[PDB]
């Protein structure tokens, strides 16, 4: 992606690949290698995403927020 | 949460989201983004929690303890 | 345990809790908090263990070996 | 393996053990401890691999690529 260090990828139920990056983005990648979307946080995403049973993607950022992102890439909430 | 670095979140069977933090807390977050509880350890919680089959949350802290926390947020035991 | 930093714990199928430690040991802990056994590697165990379908515990150490440990705590093999 | 630090291992559905290494390789190890194959990236592989439902192995490298590797050890794609 963009981050020298990547976090560890998570695999969604539909096979989307999620990885966080040093460049502040959480990347969602289709199984063919094409970017599905990328979500901007305010800091480096070193931690590995977790995926809930409805498909929500949870990941921490160094901007101090735990993010909850909908599978379509839109913010659901952030926890402070 | 509070930690610049978050650990990687774990997802409980009822959907609670658990993440450790630099601020010494393990956070339990409801799926709507509201704090369910937070558990105080004596040091920074860099490691990612694991969840047992009865729902117990295990996480290490830099106070040198492996903690076992009940789903209600109460200490079950700590290992030294 | 002994390590200031713990790795992230893994949970075996029988509920044993495995965590690696800065003190060079991989710890196996019973669900009641009592040490089941500890396995000595030649260096700090920062990575998180993985558990195979027969229950073998795989974990890397900074002595440069990937260890495969039987559930009874005895070495199965190490990879160099 | 070769890396002082190993990433955390992943276990494939057929029981192959995958671990990334400081030496730039992702190692695939048979359950008997014998090297199945190793895949060369352009940098240190600190993150832990994830395994898709068809068995593809995804892992990030410090050469800035998220790699997708077929179970036979051949590159499927890399994401930039």
Automatic annotation (TrEMBL), chains A, B, C, D:
Which lineage is the organism of this entry classified under, starting from the top rank? Bacteria, Pseudomonadati, Dictyoglomota, Dictyoglomia, Dictyoglomales
Which region of the full protein is contained in this chain? 154 to 233 of 369
Where on this chain does Zn(2+) 2 bind?
A: 64
Please indicate which superkingdom the organism of origin belongs to.
Bacteria
Cleavable signal peptide: none
Binding of Cu(2+) 1: at which residues? 24
Question: Which residue spans adopt a coiled-coil conformation according to this UniProt entry?
Answer: none
Q: Where does Zn(2+) 1 bind?
A: 24
Q: Locate the residues binding Cu(2+) 2.
A: 64
Q: Which organism is it from?
A: Dictyoglomus thermophilum (strain ATCC 35947 / DSM 3960 / H-6-12)
Any idea what this protein is called?
Answer: Cell surface protein
């Amino acid at each position: 992606t963009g981050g020298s260090v990547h976090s560890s990828p998570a695999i969604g139920q539909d096979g989307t690949i999620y990885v966080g990056s040093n460049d502040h983005y959480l990347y969602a990648i289709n199984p063919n290698g094409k970017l599905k979307w990328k979500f901007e946080t305010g800091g480096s995403v070193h931690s590995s995403p977790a995926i809930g049973q409805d498909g929500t993607i949870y990941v921490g950022s160094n901007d101090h927020y735990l993010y909850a992102i909908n599978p379509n890439g839109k913010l659901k909430w952030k926890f402070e």
